[PDB]
Amino acid sequence: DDWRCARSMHEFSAKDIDGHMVNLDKYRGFVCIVTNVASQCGKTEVNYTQLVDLHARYAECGLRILAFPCNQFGKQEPGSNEEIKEFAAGYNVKFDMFSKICVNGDDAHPLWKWMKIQPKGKGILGNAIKWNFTKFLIDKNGCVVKRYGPMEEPLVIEKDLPHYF
Numbered sequence: 001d002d003w004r005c006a007r008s009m010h011e012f013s014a015k016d017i018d019g020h021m022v023n024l025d026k027y028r029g030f031v032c033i034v035t036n037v038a039s040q041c042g043k044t045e046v047n048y049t050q051l052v053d054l055h056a057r058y059a060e061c062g063l064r065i066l067a068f069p070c071n072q073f074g075k076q077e078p079g080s081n082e083e084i085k086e087f088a089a090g091y092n093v094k095f096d097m098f099s100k101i102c103v104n105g106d107d108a109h110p111l112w113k114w115m116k117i118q119p120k121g122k123g124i125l126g127n128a129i130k131w132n133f134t135k136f137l138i139d140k141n142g143c144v145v146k147r148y149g150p151m152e153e154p155l156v157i158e159k160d161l162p163h164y165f
Contacts, residue, residue: 003110004117008142009034012111014068017081017097024111024142030064031164032138033157034115036103037067038076039087041132043150048091050154055095057158061165062140065095068112070103073132103129118144139164 006012009032010025033051038044055065069084071077077084081099088097103112115136116127121144123130131150137157139145146160 001113003114006110006114009111009115009138009144010142012114014066014101014109014111015099017069017085017099019081019099022096022098024066027064027066027138028142029140030062031140031161033063033065033154034111034136034138035065035067036070036073036112036129036132036134037084038070038073038132039079039084041074041076043133044076046153047133048088048093051095052091052093054154054158058161061161063161066098067093067095068098068103068109069100070129070132071100072102072104073129076132103134115144120144121147123147137161137164 010028012024014022014024016022051065055063069077077100084100085097101109115121121136133150135148135154135157136144137146137160145164148157
């Protein structure tokens with residue numbers, strides 16, 4: 001397992017929602033929020049709207065947001081990448097959308113396997129992602145500094161951003 005030995009998010013790569021591979025070291029020097037999103041879940045509206053809001057509010061300070069669709073939680077992201085892209089455009093999303101992935105299990109994207117065992121990325125009842133819209137806060141060096149649950153509104157992250165800018 002190479003992914004357990006990575007030291008930074010910047011070591012991983014991921015396909016964006018248009019099918020192009022993105023080297024995540026392009027986010028070096030930015031504070032990031034990484035999150036697993038879904039279109040048909042109870043917290044879809046509050047998360048998209050507050051994430052778009054935090055992005056517009058803190059874009060000039062370097063806030064970036066990475067959104068990975070995931071259908072493993074109630075099958076609440078069943079659509080195609082194009083549908084998810086159009087869904088996100090309806091919220092006026094300007095952050096970075098990726099291709100749908102798994103975040104749990106043997107086939108999970110290795111970025112997500114790594115985040116979950118980071119000291120500040122651990123969960124309480126096991127490390128697995130529990131539901132849609134788990135949020136990880138990534139410092140400018142690519143390390144995980146905080147994990148927020150599916151039921152935590154994205155605005156609760158705001159108080160912590162000044163310490164990493």
